Amino acid sequence: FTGYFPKSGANFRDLSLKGTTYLSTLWYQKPFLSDFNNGIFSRVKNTKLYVNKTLYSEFSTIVIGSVFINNSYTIVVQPHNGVLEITACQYTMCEY
């Protein structure tokens, strides 16, 4: 079958970035801001946290777009503890 598949033997890149208070301006440039081209395949870890023994699911949110300006649609895939909210809107994306 011929389809949109990853190149076997190529390298995955862990683009997840975790911070506490500060955000680095270098996190919002190349190589983190990557070219989409035909598409991407993602393998995402479900970082299962616990509060008072109650399990919570957390993972990085991905945005896909072009200029990231409110005259262009940006696709956003964001998780909410078991609910994957997917939107494609003319968002005013922040600088960081």
Ligand X SMILES: CC(=O)N[C@H]1[C@H]([C@H](O)[C@H](O)COC(C)=O)O[C@@](O[C@H](CO)[C@@H](O)[C@@H]2O[C@@](O)(C(=O)O)C[C@H](O)[C@H]2NC(C)=O)(C(=O)O)C[C@@H]1O
What is the closest distance, in whole angstroms, from the C-beta atom of residue 60 to ligand X in the complex? 11
Q: First vs last Cα of the chain: how many Å apart?
A: 40
Residue 17 touching ligand X (CB under 6 A): yes
**Which of 3, 9, 19, 31 touches ligand X by CB under 6 A?**
19
What is the closest distance, in whole angstroms, from the C-beta atom of residue 5 to ligand X in the complex? 29
Amino acid of residue 42: S
H or E segment at 66?
none
What Å distances lie between residue 93 and 16, 25, 51, 71, 75, CA to CA? Answer: 19, 15, 31, 11, 11
Residue 31 touching ligand X (CB under 6 A): no
Decide which of another protein, ligand X, none touches 43; Cβ closer than 5 to 8 Å per partner kind: another protein
Which residues of this chain interact with ligand X, rule CB under 6 A? 17-22, 24
